[PDB]
Design a protein around this ligand. Structure first.
Ligand SMILES: [Mg+2]
Length: 53
RNA sequence: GUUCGCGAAGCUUCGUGGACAUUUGGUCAAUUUGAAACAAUACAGAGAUGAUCAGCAGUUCCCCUGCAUAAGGAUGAACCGUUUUACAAAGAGAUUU
């Protein structure tokens, strides 16, 4: 042990985070919205295998 | 305070006219009384059907978890009860005018 050179790994993680930014903003943001103002009348979707028949 | 001019005393100091800069912040004010929930105790207690159990939906002025148009919530919640009139036609018997 004692190999430094964290750069490429770091870069990779940064790039991963990029993707998340969006996903988290939809997700976390959505959650917080719900917490403040929690949904009225959701519509289920029969394209699901379950419930189709 | 910066300063660009005027007027008095000794470039230094007072007295003035201007220019520069110009209206912040609050849907809120710090403990009970403007609304959080679980938990706990007590008491019961689990969809059809005889019983045991799966899953899916459905209605709603019920929601929760969930990123969710996934999925999951006691089959997620309440539905299991009440239920007498657009009501006429025919026949028989009885009291009143
Ligand atoms: Mg179940």
């Amino acid at each position: 042990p004692g190999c430094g050179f964290w750069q490429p790994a770091w870069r990779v993680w940064l790039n991963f985070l990029r993707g998340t930014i969006p996903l988290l903003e939809r997700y976390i943001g959505n959650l917080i919205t719900r917490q403040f103002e929690g949904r009225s009348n959701e519509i289920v979707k029969t394209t699901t295998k379950q419930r189709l028949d």
